[PDB]
Structure 1
Amino acid sequence: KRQVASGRAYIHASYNNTIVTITDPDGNPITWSSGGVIGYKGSRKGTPYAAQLAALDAAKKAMAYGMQSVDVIVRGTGAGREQAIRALQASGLQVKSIVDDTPVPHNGCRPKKKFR
């Protein structure tokens, strides 16, 4: 109901799922989506199609909130991570800039056994 005009788009990609959050310029979320948000349940969520449909869901939900100009933030390596962005190209939203912010440490923490 805010009619938020221009905003930020965050894409969090993993190998188990891909989820999207759309927010206002100071960062507070407007709407969001994910592979579970749509029909998919199991591993199907980590698929690229899921990513597309997700990004699109968030996109429409943004349209209804009066969204037009969008900046993108991408975090993580995952399947369909790219496909998400590809969906936001055809979103019907103008994509100003794409940025990869994926957090990586300077090696603070011992990772899980799976990860070393």
Structure 2
Amino acid sequence: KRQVASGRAYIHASYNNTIVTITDPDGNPITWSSGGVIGYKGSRKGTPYAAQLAALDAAKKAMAYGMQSVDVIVRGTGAGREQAIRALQASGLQVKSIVDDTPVPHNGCRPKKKFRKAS
């Protein structure tokens, strides 16, 4: 508890999981969730469904700090990224805005052999 009322909601989508982090206006985490926090284990953490659940778990836990509106900040490309956006919108929390800030290098480190034929 501290009472924030307005903050940030970071979505980190991956082809392996989705994990939501909610922070204060300065980017300090208040609460967080993920397909793992919810009961999911292996490959299902990446499911769009799980993302929904993780997103809702996050919102609710954020209501406890008495938060109402947030700025969604999406990072990554992964099955279940948009469900998280929707999950948040439909959860009391007011979504003042969505913004994609997935990091991309201006070609820096050689990728793993799995993600090559790129740089």
* TM score, norm. by length of structure 1: 0.99
Supply the RMSD in Å over aligned alpha carbons.
0.5
Is 1:110 matched up with 2:110? Answer: yes
SS in 1 for 2:111: coil
Q: 1:100 & 1:47 partners in 2: Cα distance? A: 20
Which position in structure 1 is the counterpart of 2:101?
Answer: 101
What is the CA distance between 1:69 and its match in structure 2? 1.2
What is the CA distance between 1:33 and its match in structure 2? 0.1
What is the CA distance between 1:41 and its match in structure 2? 0.2
Residues 36-92 of structure 1: per-residue CA shift (max 9 Å, x gap): 000000001000010000000000000111000100100000001000001011011
Structure 1: stretches of 5+ with no match in the other structure:
none
Percent of aligned pairs sharing the same letter: 100
* TM score, norm. by length of structure 2: 0.96
Moved over 3 A (4+): none
Structure 2: stretches of 5+ with no match in the other structure:
none
